[PDB]
Ligand binder design. Sequence first.
Ligand SMILES: NC(=[NH2+])NCCC[C@H](N)C(=O)O
Length: 238
Amino acid sequence: ALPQTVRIGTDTTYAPFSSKDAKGEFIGFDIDLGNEMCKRMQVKCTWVASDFDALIPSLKAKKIDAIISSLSITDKRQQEIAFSDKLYAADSRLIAAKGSPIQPTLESLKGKHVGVLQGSTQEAYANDNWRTKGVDVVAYANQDLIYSDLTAGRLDAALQAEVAASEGFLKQPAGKEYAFAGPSVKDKKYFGDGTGVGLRKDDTELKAAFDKALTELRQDGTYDKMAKKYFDFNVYGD
Ligand SMILES: NC(=[NH2+])NCCC[C@H](N)C(=O)O
């Protein structure tokens, strides 16, 4: 009972996972994964762009059928929605101006303005640990606004996925003056364990079909060859 067309929501402002090229086409590792899974599922798929914080609400409202948007698999989210098996890992890390003394600690970030994606696990962490304790945490509709406000000096630092920042900003023209500030931050509760396809809890058949296609594309080496387009390391993690 899979839909004739699976509607997949994604936030196209998170290179190299999900973004738009110059003529508006969806590109990145999430898009590649989704399209490959849809192929093996033998279903048509329609990509739907949305701000990140609108994805889970759109899913719950059945305006989309799935989310592939670096969606972290967390205990909290598992109470509202279901997930496919892990698509890849996604650690979190701060960036700031090169040579910045900033570390991902309250003491370091006091007085600093820190940008986070609204609706993200990074926002959850930053709100609880930093915002409550006086740090000017600013939440943004999308990650592109964060990068812009950073380079415009409205932000001192920003918290997002390590790989997104690296491949999508630090290794891009806009980020040549910026670097990681401190190590990545582990936090079981807030950050979860990898990303997955977000799905409605009752769509058992759809989850089975994604899980099946995902295992198959990992079995035959397609995952690693697709990954190699973007990463020279183990993006899957454990
Ligand atoms: N396409 C995106 N904007 N992805 C952002 C994901 C941020 C983080 N992994 C989360 O699940 O909250």
